[PDB]
Design a protein around this nucleic acid. Structure first.
Ligand SMILES: CO/C(CO[C@H]1O[C@H](C)[C@@H](OC)[C@H](OC)[C@@H]1O)=C1\O[C@H](Oc2ccc(/C=C(\C)C(=O)N[C@H]3[C@@H](O)[C@H](n4cnc5c(N(C)C)ncnc54)O[C@@H]3CO)cc2)[C@@H](O)[C@@H]1O
Ligand SMILES: *C(=O)[C@H](CCSC)NC=O
Ligand SMILES: [K+]
Ligand SMILES: [Mg+2]
Ligand SMILES: [Mg+2]
Ligand SMILES: [Mg+2]
Ligand SMILES: [Mg+2]
Ligand SMILES: [Mg+2]
Ligand SMILES: [Mg+2]
Ligand SMILES: [Mg+2]
Ligand SMILES: [Mg+2]
Ligand SMILES: [Mg+2]
Ligand SMILES: [Mg+2]
Ligand SMILES: [Mg+2]
Ligand SMILES: [Mg+2]
Ligand SMILES: [Mg+2]
Ligand SMILES: [Mg+2]
Ligand SMILES: [Mg+2]
Ligand SMILES: [Mg+2]
Ligand SMILES: [Mg+2]
Ligand SMILES: [Mg+2]
Ligand SMILES: [Mg+2]
Ligand SMILES: [Mg+2]
Ligand SMILES: [Mg+2]
Ligand SMILES: [Mg+2]
Ligand SMILES: [Mg+2]
Ligand SMILES: [Mg+2]
Ligand SMILES: [Mg+2]
Ligand SMILES: [Mg+2]
Ligand SMILES: [Mg+2]
Ligand SMILES: [Mg+2]
Ligand SMILES: [Mg+2]
Ligand SMILES: [Mg+2]
Ligand SMILES: [Mg+2]
Ligand SMILES: [Mg+2]
Ligand SMILES: [Mg+2]
Ligand SMILES: [Mg+2]
Ligand SMILES: [Mg+2]
Ligand SMILES: [Mg+2]
Ligand SMILES: [Mg+2]
Ligand SMILES: [Mg+2]
Ligand SMILES: [Mg+2]
Ligand SMILES: [Mg+2]
Ligand SMILES: [Mg+2]
Ligand SMILES: [Mg+2]
Ligand SMILES: [Mg+2]
Ligand SMILES: [Mg+2]
Ligand SMILES: [Mg+2]
Ligand SMILES: [Mg+2]
Ligand SMILES: [Mg+2]
Ligand SMILES: [Mg+2]
Ligand SMILES: [Mg+2]
Ligand SMILES: [Mg+2]
Ligand SMILES: [Mg+2]
Ligand SMILES: [Mg+2]
Ligand SMILES: [Mg+2]
Ligand SMILES: [Mg+2]
Ligand SMILES: [Mg+2]
Ligand SMILES: [Mg+2]
Ligand SMILES: [Mg+2]
Ligand SMILES: [Mg+2]
Ligand SMILES: [Mg+2]
Ligand SMILES: [Mg+2]
Ligand SMILES: [Mg+2]
Ligand SMILES: [Mg+2]
Ligand SMILES: [Mg+2]
Ligand SMILES: [Mg+2]
Ligand SMILES: [Mg+2]
Ligand SMILES: [Mg+2]
Ligand SMILES: [Mg+2]
Ligand SMILES: [Mg+2]
Ligand SMILES: [Mg+2]
Ligand SMILES: [Mg+2]
Ligand SMILES: [Mg+2]
Ligand SMILES: [Mg+2]
Ligand SMILES: [Mg+2]
Ligand SMILES: [Mg+2]
Ligand SMILES: [Mg+2]
Ligand SMILES: [Mg+2]
Ligand SMILES: [Mg+2]
Ligand SMILES: [Mg+2]
Ligand SMILES: [Mg+2]
Ligand SMILES: [Mg+2]
Ligand SMILES: [Mg+2]
Ligand SMILES: [Mg+2]
Ligand SMILES: [Mg+2]
Ligand SMILES: [Mg+2]
Ligand SMILES: [Mg+2]
Ligand SMILES: [Mg+2]
Ligand SMILES: [Mg+2]
Ligand SMILES: [Mg+2]
Ligand SMILES: [Mg+2]
Ligand SMILES: [Mg+2]
Ligand SMILES: [Mg+2]
Ligand SMILES: [Mg+2]
Ligand SMILES: [Mg+2]
Ligand SMILES: [Mg+2]
Ligand SMILES: [Mg+2]
Ligand SMILES: [Mg+2]
Ligand SMILES: [Mg+2]
Ligand SMILES: [Mg+2]
Ligand SMILES: [Mg+2]
Ligand SMILES: [Mg+2]
Ligand SMILES: [Mg+2]
Ligand SMILES: [Mg+2]
Ligand SMILES: [Mg+2]
Ligand SMILES: [Mg+2]
Ligand SMILES: [Mg+2]
Ligand SMILES: [Mg+2]
Ligand SMILES: [Mg+2]
Ligand SMILES: [Mg+2]
Ligand SMILES: [Mg+2]
Ligand SMILES: [Mg+2]
Ligand SMILES: [Mg+2]
Ligand SMILES: [Mg+2]
Ligand SMILES: [Mg+2]
Ligand SMILES: [Mg+2]
Ligand SMILES: [Mg+2]
Ligand SMILES: [Mg+2]
Ligand SMILES: [Mg+2]
Ligand SMILES: [Mg+2]
Ligand SMILES: [Mg+2]
Ligand SMILES: [Mg+2]
Ligand SMILES: [Mg+2]
Ligand SMILES: [Mg+2]
Ligand SMILES: [Mg+2]
Ligand SMILES: [Mg+2]
Ligand SMILES: [Mg+2]
Ligand SMILES: [Mg+2]
Ligand SMILES: [Mg+2]
Ligand SMILES: [Mg+2]
Ligand SMILES: [Mg+2]
Ligand SMILES: [Mg+2]
Ligand SMILES: [Mg+2]
Ligand SMILES: [Mg+2]
Ligand SMILES: [Mg+2]
Ligand SMILES: [Mg+2]
Ligand SMILES: [Mg+2]
Ligand SMILES: [Mg+2]
Ligand SMILES: [Mg+2]
Ligand SMILES: [Mg+2]
Ligand SMILES: [Mg+2]
Ligand SMILES: [Mg+2]
Ligand SMILES: [Mg+2]
Ligand SMILES: [Mg+2]
Ligand SMILES: [Mg+2]
Ligand SMILES: [Mg+2]
Ligand SMILES: [Mg+2]
Ligand SMILES: [Mg+2]
Ligand SMILES: [Mg+2]
Ligand SMILES: [Mg+2]
Ligand SMILES: [Mg+2]
Ligand SMILES: [Mg+2]
Ligand SMILES: [Mg+2]
Ligand SMILES: [Mg+2]
Ligand SMILES: [Mg+2]
Ligand SMILES: [Mg+2]
Ligand SMILES: [Mg+2]
Ligand SMILES: [Mg+2]
Ligand SMILES: [Mg+2]
Ligand SMILES: [Mg+2]
Ligand SMILES: [Mg+2]
Ligand SMILES: [Mg+2]
Ligand SMILES: [Mg+2]
Ligand SMILES: [Mg+2]
Ligand SMILES: [Mg+2]
Ligand SMILES: [Mg+2]
Ligand SMILES: [Mg+2]
Ligand SMILES: [Mg+2]
Ligand SMILES: [Mg+2]
Ligand SMILES: [Mg+2]
Ligand SMILES: [Mg+2]
Ligand SMILES: [Mg+2]
Ligand SMILES: [Mg+2]
Ligand SMILES: [Mg+2]
Ligand SMILES: [Mg+2]
Ligand SMILES: [Mg+2]
Ligand SMILES: [Mg+2]
Ligand SMILES: [Mg+2]
Ligand SMILES: [Mg+2]
Ligand SMILES: [Mg+2]
Ligand SMILES: [Mg+2]
Ligand SMILES: [Mg+2]
Ligand SMILES: [Mg+2]
Ligand SMILES: [Mg+2]
Ligand SMILES: [Mg+2]
Ligand SMILES: [Mg+2]
Ligand SMILES: [Mg+2]
Ligand SMILES: [Mg+2]
Ligand SMILES: [Mg+2]
Ligand SMILES: [Mg+2]
Ligand SMILES: [Mg+2]
Ligand SMILES: [Mg+2]
Ligand SMILES: [Mg+2]
Ligand SMILES: [Mg+2]
Ligand SMILES: [Mg+2]
Ligand SMILES: [Mg+2]
Ligand SMILES: [Mg+2]
Ligand SMILES: [Mg+2]
Ligand SMILES: [Mg+2]
Ligand SMILES: [Mg+2]
Ligand SMILES: [Mg+2]
Ligand SMILES: [Mg+2]
Ligand SMILES: [Mg+2]
Ligand SMILES: [Mg+2]
Ligand SMILES: [Mg+2]
Ligand SMILES: [Mg+2]
Ligand SMILES: [Mg+2]
Ligand SMILES: [Mg+2]
Ligand SMILES: [Mg+2]
Ligand SMILES: [Mg+2]
Ligand SMILES: [Mg+2]
Ligand SMILES: [Mg+2]
Ligand SMILES: [Mg+2]
Lengths: 275, 48
RNA sequence: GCGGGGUGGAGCAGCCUGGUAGCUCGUCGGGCUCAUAACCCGAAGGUCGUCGGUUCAAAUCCGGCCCCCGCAACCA
RNA sequence: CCGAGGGUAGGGCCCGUGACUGGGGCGAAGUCGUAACAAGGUAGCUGUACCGGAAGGUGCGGCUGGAU
RNA sequence: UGGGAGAGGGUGGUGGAAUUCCCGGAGUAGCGGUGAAAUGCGCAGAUACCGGGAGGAACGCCGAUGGCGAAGGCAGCCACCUGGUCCACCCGUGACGCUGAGGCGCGAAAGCGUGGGGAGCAAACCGGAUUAGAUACCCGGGUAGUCCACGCCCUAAACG
RNA sequence: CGAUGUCGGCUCGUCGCAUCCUGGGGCUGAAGAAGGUCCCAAGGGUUGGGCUGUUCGCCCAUUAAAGCGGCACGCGAGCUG
RNA sequence: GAAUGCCGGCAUGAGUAACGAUAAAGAGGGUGAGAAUCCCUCUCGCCGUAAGCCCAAGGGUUCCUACGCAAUGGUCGUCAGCGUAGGGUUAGGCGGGACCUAAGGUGAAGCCGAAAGGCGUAGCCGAAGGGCAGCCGGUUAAUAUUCCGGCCCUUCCCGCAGGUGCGAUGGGGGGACGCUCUAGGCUAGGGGGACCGGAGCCAUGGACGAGCCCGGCCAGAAGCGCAGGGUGGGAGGUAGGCAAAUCCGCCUCCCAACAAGCUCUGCGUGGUGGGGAAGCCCGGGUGACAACCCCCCGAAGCCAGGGAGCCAAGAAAAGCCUCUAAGCACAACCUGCGGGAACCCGUACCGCAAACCGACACAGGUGGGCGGGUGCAAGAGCACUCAGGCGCGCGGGAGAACCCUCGCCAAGGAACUCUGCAAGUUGGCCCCGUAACUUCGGGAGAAGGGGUGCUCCCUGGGGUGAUGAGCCCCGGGGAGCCGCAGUGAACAGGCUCUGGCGACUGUUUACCAAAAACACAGCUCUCUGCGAACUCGUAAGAGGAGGUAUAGGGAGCGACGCUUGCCCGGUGCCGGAAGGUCAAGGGGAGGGGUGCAAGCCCCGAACCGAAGCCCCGGUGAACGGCGGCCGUAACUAUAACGGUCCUAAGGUAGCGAAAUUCCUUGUCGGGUAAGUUCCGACCUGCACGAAAAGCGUAACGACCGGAGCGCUGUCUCGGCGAGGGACCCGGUGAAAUUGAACUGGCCGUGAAGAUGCGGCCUACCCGUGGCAGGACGAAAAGACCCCGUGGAGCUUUACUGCAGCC
RNA sequence: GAGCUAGCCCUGGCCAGGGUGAAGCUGGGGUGAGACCCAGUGGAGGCCCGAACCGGUGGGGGAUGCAAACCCCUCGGAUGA
């Protein structure tokens, strides 16, 4: 339920911020945080390899439990829901009856003071995690493992989810957030419910400075450069693309498929993505 | 205005120092050359 | 300067590859309709911008002339 | 002190007028088509939307003031 | 107080028929479409037939000249929440009524904003026909929209 | 071409005369006034504005008149730009 | 003898420019061979959020003293950051190390690379971050939190007493955190005092005063007081914190829950130790047995890990505390007391500058702290001024032109000019008032105006304190006084109307462009299912991301509003198990060479045979493209209409003489006396047009047009005045340039613009201040232009390769 | 060679004073309940004016400079990209 501002500055006229209404705890769990080392888009060579990165707000990494099959049958209570600057989703603090405390990304509709649990025999309720094979076909699901015991890779962004379409041998068919129809192994764990904070995408940054807070440095158009720099560089005055629209490195960027064809996982992807 | 030489004893030693030179093939050949030429100092003076 | 064009009344084939001018419309004559248009059956109309030239033979190939479109006219 | 009024500045209303522009009314025998009245040759009318030289056309829903 | 009929409204759920797309099977020279055709589709294997899957929208028979609502309007089925209303008994209040300038709310379709959704249908648009023309009527395609949520718009042959 | 800086303005002039005005003339289709045309004449004079980078030109208000040219299209070791 | 040759020497320019901020000097007395320049005194001026003081870098003896003056110092020099010599820097507590981690670097294990090398977990290194025990005063020519005095404190070793399950690199707690705003109470600092202490002073008309001038503190263990921070207590269970665990986490139960208690800091007090002004004598003495008190102001610092709010969600590790494991419980650790032990390096001096970076004693650059007083609303602004520090290392005259910086100007008032360039005007605060339009915030300081000092009287509220006096802070009303003038000095918007471009704050061509360019939120297309795509790398390995389609890459467009038409023939991208072509390879019809022969060897048709291309489709917010001629209406004119040719399709809405219009100053209207610009229209748009987006848009702009008001030295049209130069004298003394020169004018001639040739004319010899026409003046082997089978950057459907991808 | 300059990383530090007055909160009004209106409080912002600090708009000066980019006047930002 995004929040707006009155036009008392130019930028404040369009800006929207999250309502932060689900958040019940405003400092992280100290034993579960470690420093996030900012890269600025530079690799171990010290080279920029991802352009236009850096200068964003300092962050502490919240350690996230993307396994859950760790503690089969051990229930936990949802102690709190907190802000996490490293991801779009909110995170839920879990106090296991075990004495163990642990973070998961907070599904939609999850309430503090409820019980959650993981395992083959877990109830089909928002917050629980099961092997895909034990989840009813038709159920919406997030934090899905792609391969067994390798960790939740699928549907982790705010509001995203995957749906179980059917089953086929040791595999189940998922409709991914992208619209891709994919086979994922039935032994792969997955949490029931959609990821929370679905209103994340309605946020309007409002001003250049807000991009900067997010560590997003200004992106400069290829058309604004010179031929030394970019295929779209130069030209006397403004110039149309004047060649097939391309990236800084020469490759075409309007339609040119880039997935490796001989990739082994093609045997498991049923239908390429939606829109 | 602000000019280019802005002295810094730690910077000088860590950049051009004996130990810096020895850590590298090109650095070692600098010392070799300077010795061969008979330089009185093989490495910039810096007060530590 | 460079390229292209001028042919029944109108707009276009034919020229490249010499002998043969054609398509739509319009015009004239008859039909149908009470009548007009549409539609139907017939028909007439160019002598190819102009003057030369090559040739047995020129709309056609070459040259001059007059128009007509398009392109160019840059560096100080 | 007040004070006719003069002065400076800034508002409101009204009238006249203006290159040009919008449609309107009217005008014996202009041009294009033929939308409506017969089921008017696609029943009409309709609110709205988009489109088209023009009447109009089409979509969605509505009305019978529609013939059978 | 007791009782009754109803597509009255809202929310969550859910069932079958059908169209379309996709995978598989089988099978061959056409299918589709019209006044008649062409476009389109099809030997790169379509149409027709069978099994499976996805998805959206709309609810056949019951269905009526029917019912409900103040109007707009409301139709598969289920649960919850909720409005109006009729009848009976003749128990209670004792004119507490009628209408209603303003106000406020509701308000079909189309339309608009932000997200979603998208099978069928279909403005615009393209193509094939017809025609003197055909920016139409007929045919093949087809984008908004049609659907959901929330927020606007507030019109009508909103008619009895 | 081992450099002869360049339009226009400003400033400062100076020269030519095919003379714009003022001085002196002949002819006139010169009544007078005012003109036209040509001759002599370079002493002096030859305005202020609107537009535009402009030179030029058009316009406004005047004037006796609002001349045309040369001087490296005079003049950037004088200024402007 | 020439190479703008090379090295050196020495000339010319020339006694010329200059002598480095216009903060400024004068005299008296010293010293000395010599003094504007050194020392002393008095007078003058300048800085005073600095031009004073402290620290950190960097510098490296420059510090202090004596003796010097050749060179260094832009002059001088007796002086100096200069020469010679001697002296000077003292720490368990300040800083760094014997502690800890950050990025990053290094790197057992491991991985990769022809070699050299590249990675890499732990670990190690790495600091202005964490942690850690000293404050006041005195002393030297020169050091002092270092020496000394006083009063405190830390660790290590050992011993004693008492206490305890002691024990860790292992577990846990803590350390541990943002931005804005902010409470309570204090301190730093400051103002005042009729109080307390003081040498003295009474002037020149008055004052012996409740007079003037000066000062009225600093540090301090325990304890106590005030203010704060931190922290619940007990039990039972336990499967989690990679062994264990009484710890921590989780659950339950009881008690206490704005507290108290315990604990920890700040402040106050505090045994005690210090300090102590003017003035007057000569840095010292005295003052002085100095006094050392009260009221106010009050931090951004302290209590601090305080509070609240917000989104962009805010290091690590050790010290420390707690838990246990080995082990050990004659130990060992904890607490108190005592003695002993306590290392290495830095410490001088400069430090917004004459000692650092700029070749210089260079108007430049250089991080942190302190930075007093009064007044102006505030303030670190501005004026003056304290402490302190300076007058900037050439001077003295003169009183021209001209130059700079500055002041004023009659009448006019933009007539100046490309342009109001520049300079005026305006100017702070309080009050009144304030338009179109608008996205309802704005536009707004709109515009426009009134007030502003001083005196007397009355009066309202607050802080402190006590509720009162005093102090301090906000105000209200009356009556008056003076001047040309009351934010009396200094600092301190000129305004309005109207277009173009860009939404906006931002960013940029260090050093000729700040813009309309870039960026920007936002919009769309597209790639990407995660060992992602993409990027750097031979690789390993990294970034992406400890992210996962509401995410990440690429591209265009560029807030927002209303919109974004038609063309898929060509190029691109996407789809298409057919067909055509296709390389190595498979195949082996049929040949060939050689051998006496088995054989060995070479060539080789059909046919199977991948991507690619061809072929069939799709695709525009992909590359892109969006017609011609002729005719037609009852005045004319023009054509809603038609005919025909061509295309893949023929430019829609909107806009239009435009940042686009050639003809062009189009035409018409507005504004002006006059308008090639400007504004509004028209539309034959040379050559607009829809995300290289179209058309608009409130606000915004050191952007670019046009107009008006205000005011002016911009101008008519110039005048005067001021200072710094220019000039003269003493001192010091460059420069580019320079074939040599005894270097006129005209008309000619000459390689075509002659001081230098001809003919004439003019002209005594040499300077100084000035001006710039010439010496085709200087500077730079022309940037334009061409030439060179000269070079480099860039492009592509030029050629040929290579990475990469298939 | 990144002791200049460009970007990023880690850790610190800095930004006088004044002005405007968002959401929220409370109260009041309004209503069936609401939206909403008013007042007070509150203290938001690539908000406003302006030093330090960061700049470099226009003009003048300087041009063998004080300076191989400086000086004066003026001007932009100054809680934030
Ligand atoms: C020109 O370069 C120079 C001098 O350069 C030195 O000085 C320069 C200032 C220095 O610059 C830094 C340079 O340093 C390298 C060097 O020291 C030289 O070339 C000189 O020779 C010249 C060659 C040509 C020109 C003139 C040219 C090329 C030209 O185009 N003139 C045009 C233009 O000025 C003028 N003009 C045409 N159009 C329009 C027009 N329009 C279009 C509206 N509107 C208005 N003015 C127009 O028209 C003129 C004739 O048509 C002048 C001198 C030579 O003696 C001299 O050394
Ligand atoms: C032409 O005029 C040229 C201008 C220089 S453009 C780099 N100069 C000619 O002398
Ligand atoms: K050129
Ligand atoms: Mg908003
Ligand atoms: Mg939330
Ligand atoms: Mg930690
Ligand atoms: Mg690394
Ligand atoms: Mg490296
Ligand atoms: Mg990148
Ligand atoms: Mg980057
Ligand atoms: Mg989060
Ligand atoms: Mg799987
Ligand atoms: Mg959100
Ligand atoms: Mg961030
Ligand atoms: Mg960009
Ligand atoms: Mg780019
Ligand atoms: Mg460019
Ligand atoms: Mg560019
Ligand atoms: Mg490059
Ligand atoms: Mg390129
Ligand atoms: Mg290009
Ligand atoms: Mg360009
Ligand atoms: Mg262009
Ligand atoms: Mg460009
Ligand atoms: Mg393009
Ligand atoms: Mg192009
Ligand atoms: Mg690729
Ligand atoms: Mg997919
Ligand atoms: Mg240097
Ligand atoms: Mg530096
Ligand atoms: Mg150093
Ligand atoms: Mg360094
Ligand atoms: Mg080294
Ligand atoms: Mg030696
Ligand atoms: Mg040497
Ligand atoms: Mg009849
Ligand atoms: Mg004929
Ligand atoms: Mg013939
Ligand atoms: Mg013939
Ligand atoms: Mg002939
Ligand atoms: Mg012919
Ligand atoms: Mg022929
Ligand atoms: Mg050229
Ligand atoms: Mg009067
Ligand atoms: Mg008529
Ligand atoms: Mg009809
Ligand atoms: Mg009809
Ligand atoms: Mg009809
Ligand atoms: Mg038409
Ligand atoms: Mg239509
Ligand atoms: Mg009764
Ligand atoms: Mg009764
Ligand atoms: Mg009623
Ligand atoms: Mg409605
Ligand atoms: Mg559709
Ligand atoms: Mg009805
Ligand atoms: Mg030349
Ligand atoms: Mg020269
Ligand atoms: Mg007469
Ligand atoms: Mg004369
Ligand atoms: Mg004359
Ligand atoms: Mg002119
Ligand atoms: Mg002209
Ligand atoms: Mg000439
Ligand atoms: Mg010049
Ligand atoms: Mg000139
Ligand atoms: Mg000259
Ligand atoms: Mg000259
Ligand atoms: Mg110029
Ligand atoms: Mg010789
Ligand atoms: Mg020389
Ligand atoms: Mg040479
Ligand atoms: Mg030489
Ligand atoms: Mg000499
Ligand atoms: Mg000499
Ligand atoms: Mg001289
Ligand atoms: Mg000096
Ligand atoms: Mg000098
Ligand atoms: Mg002296
Ligand atoms: Mg002397
Ligand atoms: Mg002196
Ligand atoms: Mg002295
Ligand atoms: Mg002061
Ligand atoms: Mg030095
Ligand atoms: Mg000397
Ligand atoms: Mg001397
Ligand atoms: Mg000597
Ligand atoms: Mg000297
Ligand atoms: Mg000097
Ligand atoms: Mg002496
Ligand atoms: Mg000590
Ligand atoms: Mg030791
Ligand atoms: Mg360490
Ligand atoms: Mg440290
Ligand atoms: Mg820290
Ligand atoms: Mg210490
Ligand atoms: Mg103990
Ligand atoms: Mg223990
Ligand atoms: Mg321990
Ligand atoms: Mg933390
Ligand atoms: Mg904030
Ligand atoms: Mg306080
Ligand atoms: Mg104190
Ligand atoms: Mg005070
Ligand atoms: Mg008296
Ligand atoms: Mg346990
Ligand atoms: Mg004393
Ligand atoms: Mg004494
Ligand atoms: Mg706090
Ligand atoms: Mg044991
Ligand atoms: Mg040692
Ligand atoms: Mg010392
Ligand atoms: Mg000092
Ligand atoms: Mg300075
Ligand atoms: Mg400093
Ligand atoms: Mg000094
Ligand atoms: Mg230096
Ligand atoms: Mg000096
Ligand atoms: Mg200096
Ligand atoms: Mg003030
Ligand atoms: Mg001086
Ligand atoms: Mg000074
Ligand atoms: Mg005057
Ligand atoms: Mg005036
Ligand atoms: Mg003017
Ligand atoms: Mg102007
Ligand atoms: Mg100005
Ligand atoms: Mg002024
Ligand atoms: Mg002022
Ligand atoms: Mg308003
Ligand atoms: Mg306002
Ligand atoms: Mg005002
Ligand atoms: Mg007074
Ligand atoms: Mg002043
Ligand atoms: Mg101001
Ligand atoms: Mg314009
Ligand atoms: Mg711009
Ligand atoms: Mg801008
Ligand atoms: Mg724009
Ligand atoms: Mg924008
Ligand atoms: Mg923008
Ligand atoms: Mg520049
Ligand atoms: Mg440049
Ligand atoms: Mg540069
Ligand atoms: Mg400049
Ligand atoms: Mg600017
Ligand atoms: Mg947008
Ligand atoms: Mg690469
Ligand atoms: Mg990672
Ligand atoms: Mg993206
Ligand atoms: Mg594109
Ligand atoms: Mg941009
Ligand atoms: Mg752009
Ligand atoms: Mg609007
Ligand atoms: Mg196409
Ligand atoms: Mg195609
Ligand atoms: Mg295509
Ligand atoms: Mg077949
Ligand atoms: Mg083969
Ligand atoms: Mg094309
Ligand atoms: Mg086509
Ligand atoms: Mg169209
Ligand atoms: Mg349209
Ligand atoms: Mg036009
Ligand atoms: Mg015009
Ligand atoms: Mg024009
Ligand atoms: Mg023109
Ligand atoms: Mg005109
Ligand atoms: Mg006019
Ligand atoms: Mg202009
Ligand atoms: Mg205009
Ligand atoms: Mg026209
Ligand atoms: Mg484009
Ligand atoms: Mg625009
Ligand atoms: Mg605007
Ligand atoms: Mg600007
Ligand atoms: Mg003057
Ligand atoms: Mg003077
Ligand atoms: Mg001398
Ligand atoms: Mg001689
Ligand atoms: Mg002579
Ligand atoms: Mg000649
Ligand atoms: Mg001559
Ligand atoms: Mg001779
Ligand atoms: Mg001679
Ligand atoms: Mg002679
Ligand atoms: Mg003569
Ligand atoms: Mg002289
Ligand atoms: Mg002179
Ligand atoms: Mg001269
Ligand atoms: Mg000359
Ligand atoms: Mg030069
Ligand atoms: Mg050369
Ligand atoms: Mg040359
Ligand atoms: Mg050159
Ligand atoms: Mg060649
Ligand atoms: Mg050659
Ligand atoms: Mg070449
Ligand atoms: Mg090359
Ligand atoms: Mg290196
Ligand atoms: Mg750097
Ligand atoms: Mg540095
Ligand atoms: Mg400061
Ligand atoms: Mg307020
Ligand atoms: Mg609040
Ligand atoms: Mg601001
Ligand atoms: Mg400047
Ligand atoms: Mg100025
Ligand atoms: Mg210069
Ligand atoms: Mg300056
Ligand atoms: Mg200045
Ligand atoms: Mg200034
Ligand atoms: Mg400001
Ligand atoms: Mg920041």
């Amino acid at each position: 339920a995004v929040k707006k501002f009155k036009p008392y500055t130019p930028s404040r006229r369009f800006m929207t911020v999250a309502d932060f209404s689900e958040i019940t705890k405003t400092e992280p769990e100290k034993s579960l945080v470690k420093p996030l080392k900012k890269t600025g888009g530079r690799n171990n060579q010290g080279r920029i390899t991802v352009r236009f990165r850096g200068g964003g707000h300092k962050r502490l990494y919240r350690i996230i439990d993307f396994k859950r099959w760790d503690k089969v049958g051990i229930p936990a209570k949802v102690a709190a829901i907190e802000y996490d600057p490293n991801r779009s989703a909110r995170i839920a603090l879990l106090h296991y009856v075990d004495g163990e405390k642990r973070y998961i990304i907070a599904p939609d509709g999850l309430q503090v003071g409820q019980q959650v649990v993981a395992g083959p025999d877990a109830p089909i309720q928002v917050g629980n995690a099961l092997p895909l094979r034990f989840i009813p076909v038709g159920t919406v699901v997030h934090a899905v493992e792609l391969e067994p015991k390798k960790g939740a890779k699928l549907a982790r962004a705010a509001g995203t989810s995957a749906q179980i379409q059917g089953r086929e041998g040791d595999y189940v068919i998922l409709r991914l957030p992208s619209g891709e129809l994919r086979k994922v192994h039935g032994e792969c764990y997955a949490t029931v419910g959609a990821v929370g904070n679905a209103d994340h995408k309605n946020i309007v940054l409002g001003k250049a400075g807000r991009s900067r807070w997010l560590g997003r440095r200004p992106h400069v158009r290829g058309a604004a450069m010179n031929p030394v720099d970019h295929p779209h560089g130069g030209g006397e005055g403004r110039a149309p693309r004047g060649r097939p629209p391309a990236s800084p490195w020469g490759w075409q960027t309007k339609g040119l498929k880039t997935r490796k064809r001989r990739k082994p996982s093609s045997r498991f992807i049923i239908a390429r993505r939606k829109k | 205005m602000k000019r280019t030489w802005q002295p810094n004893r730690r910077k000088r030693a860590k950049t051009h120092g004996f130990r810096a030179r020895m850590r590298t093939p090109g650095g070692r050949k600098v010392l070799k050359r300077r010795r061969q030429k008979g330089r009185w100092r093989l490495t910039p003076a810096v007060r530590k």
